[PDB]
Design a protein around this ligand. Structure first.
Ligand code: HEC
Ligand code: HEC
Lengths: 110, 100
């Protein structure tokens, strides 16, 4: 898959995760979706890491999205929504770092 | 160099490269974006190609650190704008555009 295909596939999980970061909640069904969304992002950045051969920085940028995605999964399992919130903000910066460095002249989300 | 390995994005050189705490025109990605090859704006200013083995062989590690501190021409000086430890991480980011 291309990077564009990988990222397109992460966009709905990213939005599903974003929608829950503004709650007070702890619904077991919402932790199920949240963990599944975090796994989709982890899978996407690992696929980019392993199969989109750019340079070493590109690998570390994927790793730093994964760093925060795994923290979100942990925080969700512990029902620590403040941590979910902060780690999701940091994961969003991690997504944006790659976009600004490698697609500098295209307007991209998030 | 002590290379930066993946961690919290608030402590990452990539966040600084992508302009955290800096004006756009003082942010590395503005001139050295497009994966280190140079943006339109950076090419107007004559940026080198960080992905080129030719450019990389023109500088030592120490010269990259000294450059980031001191600046040169339109490349801004960053001494006192990030920590010495961050500058050393940034030198590794510069190196890492040319390797797999
Ligand atoms: C580099 C290692 C990246 C990481 C980490 C993330 N993204 Fe990305 N993204 C990247 C590139 C090079 C591109 C341009 C693709 C192209 O060639 O067109 C993108 C693009 C997107 C898109 C747009 C997809 C489309 O419909 O065209 C989205 C929605 C996107 N990126 C989202 C996204 C998210 C949410 C990320 C963190 C979980 C993320 N990306 C990381 C490179 C990289
Ligand atoms: C445009 C306003 C720039 C910004 C922001 C950054 N750089 Fe730059 N850089 C720029 C130019 C025009 C040049 C060539 C300067 C010259 O006369 O040769 C450079 C050069 C570098 C180099 C190579 C050293 C050199 O050729 O002098 C490095 C390692 C470098 N720049 C790093 C760098 C970093 C880490 C930046 C963000 C902290 C950064 N530059 C921003 C233009 C611009």
């Amino acid at each position: 898959a291309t990077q564009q295909e990988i990222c397109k596939n992460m966009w709905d999980p990213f939005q599903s995760m974003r929608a829950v970061t503004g709650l007070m909640e702890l619904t077991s069904g919402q932790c199920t979706q949240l963990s599944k969304d975090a796994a989709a992002i982890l899978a996407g950045v690992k696929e980019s890491h392993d199969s989109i051969s750019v340079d070493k920085n590109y690998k570390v940028l994927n790793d730093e999205v994964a760093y925060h995605a795994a923290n979100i999964d942990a925080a969700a399992k512990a029902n620590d929504l403040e941590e979910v919130q902060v780690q999701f903000r940091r994961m969003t910066i991690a997504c944006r770092n790659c976009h600004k460095i490698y697609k500098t002249e295209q307007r991209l989300v998030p | 160099l002590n290379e930066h390995t993946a961690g919290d994005t608030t402590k990452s050189p990539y966040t600084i490269y992508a302009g955290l705490g800096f004006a756009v025109q003082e942010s590395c990605y503005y001139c050295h974006g497009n994966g280190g090859k140079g943006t339109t704006e950076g090419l107007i200013f004559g940026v080198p190609d960080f992905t080129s083995t030719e450019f990389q062989s023109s500088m030592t590690d120490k010269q990259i650190i000294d450059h980031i501190n001191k600046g040169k021409g339109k490349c801004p000086s960053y001494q006192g704008k990030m920590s010495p430890e961050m500058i050393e991480k940034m030198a590794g980011v510069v190196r890492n555009f040319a390797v797999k």
